[PDB]
Amino acid sequence: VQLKESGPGLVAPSQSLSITCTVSGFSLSRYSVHWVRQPPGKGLEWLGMIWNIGSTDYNSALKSRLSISKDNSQSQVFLKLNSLQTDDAAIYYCARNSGFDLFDFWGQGTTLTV
Amino acid sequence: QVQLKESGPGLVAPSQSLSITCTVSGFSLSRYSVHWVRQPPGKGLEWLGMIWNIGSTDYNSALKSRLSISKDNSQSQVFLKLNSLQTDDAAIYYCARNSGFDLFDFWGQGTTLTVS
Amino acid sequence: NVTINPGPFAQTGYAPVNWGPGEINDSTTVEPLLDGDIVISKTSLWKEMQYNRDITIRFKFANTIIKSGGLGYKWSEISFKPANYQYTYTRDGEEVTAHTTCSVNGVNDFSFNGGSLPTDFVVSKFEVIKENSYVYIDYWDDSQAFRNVVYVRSLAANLNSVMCTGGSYNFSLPVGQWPVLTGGAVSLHSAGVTLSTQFTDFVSLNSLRFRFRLAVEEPHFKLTRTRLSRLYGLPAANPNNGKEYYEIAGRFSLISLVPSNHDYQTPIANSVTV
Amino acid sequence: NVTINPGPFAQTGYAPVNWGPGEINDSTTVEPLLDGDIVISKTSLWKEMQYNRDITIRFKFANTIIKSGGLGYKWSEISFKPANYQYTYTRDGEEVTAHTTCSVNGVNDFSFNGGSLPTDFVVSKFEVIKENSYVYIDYWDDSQAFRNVVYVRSLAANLNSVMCTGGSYNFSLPVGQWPVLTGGAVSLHSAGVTLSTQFTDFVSLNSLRFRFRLAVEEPHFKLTRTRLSRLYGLPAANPNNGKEYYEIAGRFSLISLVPS
Amino acid sequence: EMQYNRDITIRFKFANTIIKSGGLGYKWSEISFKPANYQYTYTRDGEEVTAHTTCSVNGVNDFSFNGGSLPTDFVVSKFEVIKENSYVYIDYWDDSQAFRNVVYVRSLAANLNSVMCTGGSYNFSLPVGQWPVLTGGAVSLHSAGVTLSTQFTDFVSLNSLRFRFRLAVEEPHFKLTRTRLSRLYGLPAANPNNGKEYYEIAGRFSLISL
Amino acid sequence: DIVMTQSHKFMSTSVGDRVSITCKASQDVTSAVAWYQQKPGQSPKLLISSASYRYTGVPDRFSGSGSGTDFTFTISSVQAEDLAVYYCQQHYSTPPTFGAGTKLEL
Amino acid sequence: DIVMTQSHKFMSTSVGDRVSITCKASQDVTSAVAWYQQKPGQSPKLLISSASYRYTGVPDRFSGSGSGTDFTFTISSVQAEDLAVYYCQQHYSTPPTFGAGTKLELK
């Protein structure tokens, strides 16, 4: 199994954002994926989850601002965040789920500059 | 106990409609099904149509397109309608219950029809 | 390149399925080793329709026999097991293929103890179905009707009764006379239908289950050379009694949903030329 | 561009249901006498939707034991039996009531025979479950989601695991030493969910069935005063071990076709 | 002004490209047309003549079916189909006196009879489920003008005559089974040749080379 | 469809004498036959439900038999109450279909 | 929502001496608490999946305990590559919620 991210790295306020997590070794029709981020020098958080079936679940606060999507054809997953701030700057991770909300394998993690 | 009673005009004219009402008793129409048959004078008997326990209905091919079977579960009464009848359609009509596949168990008294 | 635009209503529909058998009642045996809200799609069209078709069902029982260790006089188990069958019959329309899978539930378990010697004869369990028990005959078909059993609103089957009779089975003892198990009949009367879908990771495997109630009828079943006598039921020794298949025949009506070939959404001017 | 259906649309809908339990693997025992086409409704308007919510499954097993007549040393059955539970809990600021039923299939039955004298201890059937068995738990609720489970397309559930361990049963012999059964434990992992409907005459009767897969764990279980060998599994003697409820937590997502 | 005018026998066959998208076998992307060549020998005027003919299409219509975003469901994003709007172009090269002196012409024309082209049946290969098919479709070709043109084949440039053909749609319907689509009209690009090697057109062409 | 026939149409049978009747089918009906009795001024009644089954309350003298195509209905003693018409139904297919109707005479 | 806290942000132990950490919860999460480890320049890893169960291959010198509200994580002997941050998760509710992140320093 290998989870790799890919993103811009530098962005401007009041704009969009798109990251893509490319998976290999496991099928996205047998597992689910989670997105998390780490405000610099602060506790880690849950952002959203995309299930095995196609349904998605979001964090309450950023519900209004994000979309999560996937494509079994590209064996990839992707997230979009819009109308960002300075506070939204952090390092972003995509992870796999095994049980209820246990994270098993993680990616390298891209850092963001706004 | 169970009782099946019919009710109909008795006399009718060609090129007209027809309506008959089997009034069941002692058994729910949501637990059983009902069949319509008739016996033209002499000769033998036929099958006309059947109304199921759930609401679906099945008809006989020869008389198809002329028959109309329906019921009201709360009224405990089935009703059949035949239109555009002829002299050949004259017969005694009998509503009957079904137990297995097509076994008839209890029958009504049977009304006789005259067309002229 | 003209581009035919999509219409307002969504084209959602049935989900992929594979027709198969259901669960079963099973139990193994261990012998000792010593002796002694979000919206995912837009609006879509669906209409309720009636499919009334004839159903012919052919079934066959199966049996399993397990003898214990030692001199070989005594048996450990004689019981039922699922069995499958396939065939082709003719609806008035065409020929259709069919599969079936029988099974039981609520079975009664009898035993007999001839003695505590190595030579004496004991059978620790032989099963028998009876009043309380039931029989479930699952079914799937190739016709058009079975393609629309998903999303069913109502379903009712009118079926005939059948009689199953017991054959005979001979206990091969190393030495001495051979006792025998013989007869026993039960008669199936229809009860309601059951549908079921198992949601595994990518296929909705599904199945029906025709239930069937039982009543007891003569002949009796008997074990020869012993005190057990004249008890009612269908032993598991030889249920088929030399017949390839028992049959049930009757009608079934279903009221279900169907994707609406509504006929309005069409590219304008889809017609022959003029 | 394409033509569009504009007329007034008809009102088909869900059909009356009553939520309840499913079938169950059962078997009695008889003991010796002595001791020696037509369109029913018009075009309508439907829609597909998500219902994703949390869940707390609380359950508890049940056992049956029966003795055989005589001196009182012979048991004929130490077996399992379905059990029911009714509870309440909170989910996103809503109190839901709920009912649960626990049955077991795939059982592996055992036996011991200490001898044939009238006095010898004997147990003809005590059943355990040990990696060749499944526990099936049925659940119904009072929320809105369960109202719209009719006509479902896909359901999935991410649920935590729960370890169940055995207690101890002290067999009562009229005279002499009392042997005892003690030990055993299994872990219940999740597997596929099932939905089953029964079209009886009156009204449809449906049932949900979460299906769990067992895996054996320590401690080992044993029967004293005999030669049974430290086997592994969950003995059906005292499965819940003085705990009122075992519980599992999780989340379930269903994708259902709801009337629009 | 040396005049050449001859009987003529055209032969041809379409060809399609199918491209599926990745895994699980459900979601196709394109079912389109593409040009196609055929070579043959026939006898006319008591002489044996070899020929090479290439068929292409323009004005094609694009249809689509989207069964949903959920993975398992069936999807085909673009299958082309021909109708009254579209035009066919078939080009012909022969091996005789005439088609050596077909450059520098003063007048071209031709009288050609007509033909019918019918669809076949394509079977989508789903891993699990019942296989939806694509069947039906008809169309009839009726002649139009002639022009000069050149077709390039096997690294040898060649000088030939290009016939245009207008279309008229006709029955049977074309339909996707196991879906709501049904009773559409035209010729889809799944199996147009229908196992038939060659449709053939016959007639005569008039030419006054200079 | 299914088609059935009866041997006779009227049969002279004395009181207290054994009597049998047969009706034939065209296709193969394994064991699905029924027998109805219609007295004058009465509605038909069900006496047989299978190849040789007896419905509840039917008198003992009556019985039936047959398998495959040929099927028969037998009484041991005729009695005054037994003077009536008797029909044979088939129920192994979609259109239930009766026979012509053969009866008795004293 | 769910809320968690960890006692200190630094805990100091020489190679070979017991480490012991605690994190409290804002409700009675029944045995559903996990523990992650993040080394410098590394992505977090899963060590103690349920309050006590150790996931897959992790050394034995790790272990955990606790029930109800209070939960703890204990190492018996320290090594040189254990200097890392450790987080405690809670998995009995919709928003998985980590702690702040407490780590170790060497003497």
Side-chain angles (χ1 to χ4, degrees):
Chain A
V1 61
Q2 293 177 335
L3 274 67
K4 179 89 181 169
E5 295 84 356
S6 63
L10 167 63
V11 63
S14 178
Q15 309 301 125
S16 187
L17 165 62
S18 58
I19 297 162
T20 297
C21 181
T22 294
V23 295
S24 64
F26 81 100
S27 64
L28 295 174
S29 309
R30 294 183 181 277
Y31 295 87
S32 64
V33 165
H34 300 291
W35 288 100
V36 297
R37 80 173 169 175
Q38 179 165 18
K42 155 170 170 80
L44 275 74
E45 322 197 307
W46 190 66
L47 300 169
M49 168 185 193
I50 191 159
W51 285 57
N52 186 340
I53 61 171
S55 188
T56 189
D57 198 59
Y58 297 140
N59 182 1
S60 70
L62 295 174
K63 183 178 179 180
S64 64
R65 293 182 183 174
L66 62 80
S67 79
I68 305 186
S69 295
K70 64 179 180 180
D71 191 0
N72 289 284
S73 294
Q74 294 300 320
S75 307
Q76 76 185 18
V77 176
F78 59 91
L79 188 147
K80 291 183 183 176
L81 187 63
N82 62 34
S83 295
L84 62 80
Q85 277 69 38
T86 184
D87 289 345
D88 286 350
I91 304 174
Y92 287 62
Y93 292 68
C94 53
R96 203 190 67 181
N97 189 27
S98 66
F100 175 61
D101 273 19
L102 304 197
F103 307 79
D104 205 346
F105 302 130
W106 300 54
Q108 293 177 335
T110 185
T111 189
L112 177 61
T113 299
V114 64
Chain B
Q1 67 276 18
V2 61
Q3 300 173 4
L4 275 78
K5 293 179 179 179
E6 295 85 355
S7 63
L11 167 63
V12 62
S15 295
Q16 309 301 125
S17 187
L18 165 62
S19 58
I20 294 169
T21 288
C22 183
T23 298
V24 306
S25 295
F27 75 109
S28 64
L29 295 168
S30 309
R31 187 67 198 73
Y32 295 87
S33 64
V34 165
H35 297 165
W36 286 103
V37 297
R38 83 184 176 166
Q39 64 206 20
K43 320 307 309 307
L45 278 63
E46 293 177 350
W47 190 66
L48 300 169
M50 156 167 184
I51 191 159
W52 281 59
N53 208 25
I54 63 184
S56 178
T57 189
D58 184 54
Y59 296 136
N60 171 36
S61 64
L63 295 174
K64 209 145 160 67
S65 183
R66 259 190 267 168
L67 295 169
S68 282
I69 291 156
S70 179
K71 69 200 157 88
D72 289 345
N73 289 337
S74 64
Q75 294 300 320
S76 59
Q77 64 180 20
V78 180
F79 52 106
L80 188 147
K81 291 183 183 176
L82 177 63
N83 59 77
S84 59
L85 62 80
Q86 299 78 23
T87 191
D88 289 345
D89 295 18
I92 294 169
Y93 287 61
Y94 279 89
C95 59
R97 204 190 67 181
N98 192 52
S99 295
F101 174 63
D102 273 19
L103 304 197
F104 307 79
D105 205 346
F106 302 130
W107 297 58
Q109 308 92 2
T111 185
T112 189
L113 177 63
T114 59
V115 63
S116 64
Chain C
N1 289 337
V2 168
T3 59
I4 303 301
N5 285 344
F9 299 92
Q11 295 287 110
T12 67
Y14 290 156
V17 296
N18 191 4
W19 288 94
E23 292 301 338
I24 61 171
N25 163 24
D26 181 65
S27 64
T28 59
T29 312
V30 182
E31 293 177 350
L33 308 187
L34 188 147
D35 194 277
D37 313 328
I38 316 308
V39 164
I40 176 160
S41 292
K42 300 288 98 176
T43 68
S44 295
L45 275 66
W46 288 94
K47 52 170 168 82
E48 285 191 345
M49 293 259 287
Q50 316 181 0
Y51 295 92
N52 205 332
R53 311 271 201 272
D54 289 274
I55 186 167
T56 59
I57 298 172
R58 298 176 188 176
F59 64 98
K60 183 203 323 192
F61 293 95
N63 63 327
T64 189
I65 294 170
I66 301 151
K67 170 137 51 164
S68 181
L71 275 66
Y73 287 106
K74 64 176 183 142
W75 278 256
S76 177
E77 181 177 9
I78 298 179
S79 63
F80 280 97
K81 67 172 182 182
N84 56 43
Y85 192 93
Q86 64 184 349
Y87 52 87
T88 59
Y89 74 83
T90 50
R91 290 193 225 259
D92 65 318
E94 293 177 350
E95 177 148 329
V96 303
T97 189
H99 301 81
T100 70
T101 295
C102 196
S103 49
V104 301
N105 171 297
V107 63
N108 301 269
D109 285 352
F110 283 83
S111 178
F112 167 62
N113 192 31
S116 178
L117 275 66
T119 54
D120 298 337
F121 170 51
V122 305
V123 175
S124 292
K125 174 171 81 144
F126 64 101
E127 315 210 336
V128 75
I129 45 168
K130 292 189 292 185
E131 300 172 53
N132 59 346
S133 79
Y134 283 125
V135 296
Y136 309 134
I137 294 169
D138 289 345
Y139 185 94
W140 63 91
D141 175 69
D142 181 65
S143 174
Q144 72 199 265
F146 272 65
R147 306 197 277 92
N148 60 78
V149 171
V150 73
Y151 304 156
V152 63
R153 180 167 93 83
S154 301
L155 167 53
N158 289 337
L159 290 160
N160 276 311
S161 66
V162 59
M163 292 194 75
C164 295
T165 56
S168 188
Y169 180 81
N170 59 337
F171 296 88
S172 295
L173 270 52
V175 179
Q177 286 177 332
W178 282 10
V180 167
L181 188 59
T182 297
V186 70
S187 64
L188 285 64
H189 303 292
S190 64
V193 188
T194 299
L195 178 73
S196 61
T197 59
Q198 186 173 355
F199 295 104
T200 59
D201 61 356
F202 69 88
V203 183
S204 168
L205 188 147
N206 55 349
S207 70
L208 295 174
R209 185 182 295 276
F210 287 101
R211 282 187 57 198
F212 270 102
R213 187 172 57 81
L214 301 161
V216 291
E217 299 299 349
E218 288 195 352
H220 292 58
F221 79 83
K222 64 179 180 180
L223 178 59
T224 300
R225 300 288 182 268
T226 48
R227 294 183 181 277
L228 188 147
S229 178
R230 293 187 63 80
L231 295 174
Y232 298 111
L234 179 65
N238 200 20
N240 285 309
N241 199 338
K243 296 186 164 145
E244 278 183 358
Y245 59 74
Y246 298 103
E247 183 178 2
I248 294 169
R251 282 314 266 288
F252 76 95
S253 182
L254 62 80
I255 294 170
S256 64
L257 272 57
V258 186
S260 182
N261 306 303
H262 55 284
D263 188 23
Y264 275 56
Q265 297 191 95
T266 60
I268 281 175
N270 63 333
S271 178
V272 302
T273 193
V274 293
Chain D
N1 289 337
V2 63
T3 299
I4 301 176
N5 188 0
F9 285 97
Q11 293 177 335
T12 67
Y14 288 161
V17 296
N18 191 4
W19 288 95
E23 292 301 338
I24 61 171
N25 63 326
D26 190 358
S27 64
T28 66
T29 312
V30 182
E31 293 177 350
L33 318 188
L34 275 66
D35 175 43
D37 289 345
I38 287 142
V39 63
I40 186 167
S41 295
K42 293 146 74 67
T43 51
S44 63
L45 187 63
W46 276 88
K47 183 169 71 172
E48 190 178 2
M49 198 173 275
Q50 290 182 22
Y51 294 91
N52 192 31
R53 296 178 205 292
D54 296 273
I55 206 168
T56 50
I57 298 166
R58 298 217 264 285
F59 63 89
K60 72 189 187 74
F61 297 89
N63 64 58
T64 304
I65 67 174
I66 47 174
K67 291 174 65 175
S68 289
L71 298 198
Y73 291 85
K74 293 184 175 71
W75 287 251
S76 186
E77 185 172 71
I78 309 292
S79 55
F80 267 121
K81 183 173 149 280
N84 287 336
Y85 194 52
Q86 180 175 2
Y87 55 91
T88 299
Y89 62 98
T90 61
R91 194 211 302 165
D92 305 347
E94 299 179 22
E95 290 183 354
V96 300
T97 67
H99 292 73
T100 306
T101 291
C102 180
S103 76
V104 67
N105 192 31
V107 163
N108 309 283
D109 57 358
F110 275 100
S111 179
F112 170 64
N113 176 35
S116 295
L117 295 174
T119 52
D120 297 311
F121 174 50
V122 174
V123 177
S124 168
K125 188 194 170 82
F126 67 89
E127 88 193 34
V128 304
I129 45 175
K130 44 168 191 66
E131 189 167 2
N132 192 31
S133 64
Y134 299 105
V135 59
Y136 299 147
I137 299 159
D138 308 296
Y139 172 87
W140 59 87
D141 181 65
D142 181 65
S143 295
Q144 64 180 20
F146 272 77
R147 296 162 215 158
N148 57 79
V149 168
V150 164
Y151 307 159
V152 63
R153 206 201 173 286
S154 182
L155 188 147
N158 283 283
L159 265 63
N160 292 271
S161 66
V162 60
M163 292 177 72
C164 315
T165 184
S168 62
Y169 188 53
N170 289 284
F171 292 125
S172 176
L173 305 178
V175 175
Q177 186 173 355
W178 287 4
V180 69
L181 181 63
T182 301
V186 297
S187 56
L188 281 52
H189 300 291
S190 54
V193 191
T194 300
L195 161 59
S196 60
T197 189
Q198 182 180 341
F199 296 107
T200 189
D201 289 345
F202 296 98
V203 64
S204 309
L205 184 148
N206 47 6
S207 178
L208 186 147
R209 175 155 287 181
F210 292 113
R211 302 178 40 264
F212 292 82
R213 173 189 56 75
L214 280 68
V216 291
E217 292 294 329
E218 297 197 356
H220 60 285
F221 74 88
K222 64 174 189 181
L223 178 46
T224 53
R225 295 277 301 172
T226 186
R227 294 183 181 277
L228 275 66
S229 64
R230 293 182 183 174
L231 275 66
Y232 295 93
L234 183 52
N238 185 13
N240 46 31
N241 186 13
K243 302 205 280 278
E244 186 160 43
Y245 56 71
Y246 296 103
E247 183 178 2
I248 290 177
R251 191 86 186 278
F252 69 87
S253 191
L254 62 80
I255 302 183
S256 82
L257 183 70
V258 295
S260 178
Chain E
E1 293 177 350
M2 286 278 264
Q3 307 177 335
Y4 300 93
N5 62 350
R6 309 285 188 98
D7 185 61
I8 195 182
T9 312
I10 294 169
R11 293 182 183 174
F12 64 99
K13 62 188 181 58
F14 303 94
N16 55 318
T17 53
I18 316 303
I19 294 169
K20 178 149 44 165
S21 183
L24 294 171
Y26 288 110
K27 313 204 270 180
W28 278 257
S29 187
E30 316 188 283
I31 294 160
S32 295
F33 284 113
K34 64 164 183 91
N37 64 34
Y38 182 70
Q39 64 180 20
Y40 52 96
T41 299
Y42 67 104
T43 185
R44 59 176 182 183
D45 289 345
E47 293 177 350
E48 293 177 350
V49 296
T50 59
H52 191 241
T53 59
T54 60
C55 166
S56 71
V57 178
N58 292 280
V60 66
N61 289 337
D62 292 9
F63 277 56
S64 74
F65 174 96
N66 183 236
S69 53
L70 195 147
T72 65
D73 62 10
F74 181 52
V75 179
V76 63
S77 183
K78 180 162 88 78
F79 56 96
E80 277 141 28
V81 63
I82 308 180
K83 303 181 79 167
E84 182 150 13
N85 313 328
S86 185
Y87 277 87
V88 169
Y89 295 98
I90 294 153
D91 289 345
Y92 167 90
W93 179 83
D94 197 70
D95 176 10
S96 287
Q97 293 169 311
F99 277 63
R100 295 176 64 186
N101 300 355
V102 63
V103 296
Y104 295 94
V105 296
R106 295 287 299 278
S107 50
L108 289 191
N111 314 326
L112 304 171
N113 55 11
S114 61
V115 291
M116 178 167 295
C117 293
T118 73
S121 68
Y122 190 72
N123 293 359
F124 291 82
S125 78
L126 264 56
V128 177
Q130 178 51 28
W131 276 359
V133 290
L134 172 55
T135 65
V139 71
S140 53
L141 281 84
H142 289 295
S143 189
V146 185
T147 62
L148 280 72
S149 68
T150 59
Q151 66 208 58
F152 312 120
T153 189
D154 201 63
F155 296 96
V156 299
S157 162
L158 295 174
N159 289 284
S160 64
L161 297 192
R162 171 182 293 176
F163 303 100
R164 189 177 69 183
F165 298 87
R166 181 177 65 83
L167 295 174
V169 64
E170 297 189 328
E171 293 177 350
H173 318 87
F174 83 87
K175 79 195 177 262
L176 179 63
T177 309
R178 206 152 166 78
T179 59
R180 296 182 183 174
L181 293 194
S182 64
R183 291 177 64 84
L184 284 164
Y185 269 78
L187 170 62
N191 194 301
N193 284 316
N194 198 37
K196 217 188 308 186
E197 269 188 288
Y198 57 89
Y199 309 102
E200 72 171 316
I201 300 162
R204 170 156 285 202
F205 80 85
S206 301
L207 188 157
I208 292 155
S209 185
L210 188 74
Chain F
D1 69 328
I2 303 301
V3 175
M4 311 267 287
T5 75
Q6 289 185 339
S7 59
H8 316 95
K9 205 193 159 191
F10 296 97
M11 283 167 95
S12 48
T13 76
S14 64
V15 184
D17 181 65
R18 181 177 65 83
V19 293
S20 73
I21 302 181
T22 181
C23 75
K24 183 178 179 180
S26 295
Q27 290 159 23
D28 204 330
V29 175
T30 59
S31 64
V33 166
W35 294 84
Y36 293 103
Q37 171 173 25
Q38 198 192 6
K39 286 175 236 200
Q42 289 280 329
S43 52
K45 309 286 179 60
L46 183 85
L47 282 83
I48 302 295
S49 310
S50 295
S52 64
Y53 166 94
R54 182 182 65 198
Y55 176 77
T56 59
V58 171
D60 187 85
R61 64 185 164 281
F62 299 113
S63 64
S65 83
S67 283
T69 59
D70 298 341
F71 295 103
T72 75
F73 177 31
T74 68
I75 305 168
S76 62
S77 64
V78 169
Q79 293 177 335
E81 293 177 350
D82 296 10
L83 300 173
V85 66
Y86 301 86
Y87 290 95
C88 55
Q89 181 189 343
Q90 178 275 5
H91 64 100
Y92 179 64
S93 192
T94 299
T97 291
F98 298 173
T102 185
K103 75 165 219 194
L104 298 183
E105 183 178 2
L106 188 147
Chain G
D1 68 328
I2 307 307
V3 175
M4 311 267 287
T5 75
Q6 264 178 350
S7 58
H8 300 291
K9 293 179 179 179
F10 311 93
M11 308 205 83
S12 295
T13 59
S14 62
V15 175
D17 181 65
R18 291 191 68 77
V19 170
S20 64
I21 294 169
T22 181
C23 75
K24 277 216 192 83
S26 178
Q27 258 162 335
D28 289 345
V29 177
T30 299
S31 178
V33 175
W35 295 84
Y36 293 103
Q37 186 173 355
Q38 198 192 6
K39 286 175 236 200
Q42 289 280 329
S43 52
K45 309 286 179 60
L46 183 85
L47 270 64
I48 304 304
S49 72
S50 306
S52 64
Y53 185 94
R54 302 222 319 286
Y55 204 67
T56 59
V58 169
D60 192 0
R61 53 176 183 287
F62 297 103
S63 64
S65 83
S67 283
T69 59
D70 289 345
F71 295 103
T72 75
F73 177 31
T74 68
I75 305 168
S76 64
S77 82
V78 186
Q79 318 305 125
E81 70 272 17
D82 304 344
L83 287 155
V85 66
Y86 301 86
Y87 290 95
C88 55
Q89 163 199 27
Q90 178 278 335
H91 52 95
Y92 170 69
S93 312
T94 299
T97 299
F98 299 178
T102 185
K103 63 185 168 101
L104 318 169
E105 293 177 350
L106 195 56
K107 292 189 292 185

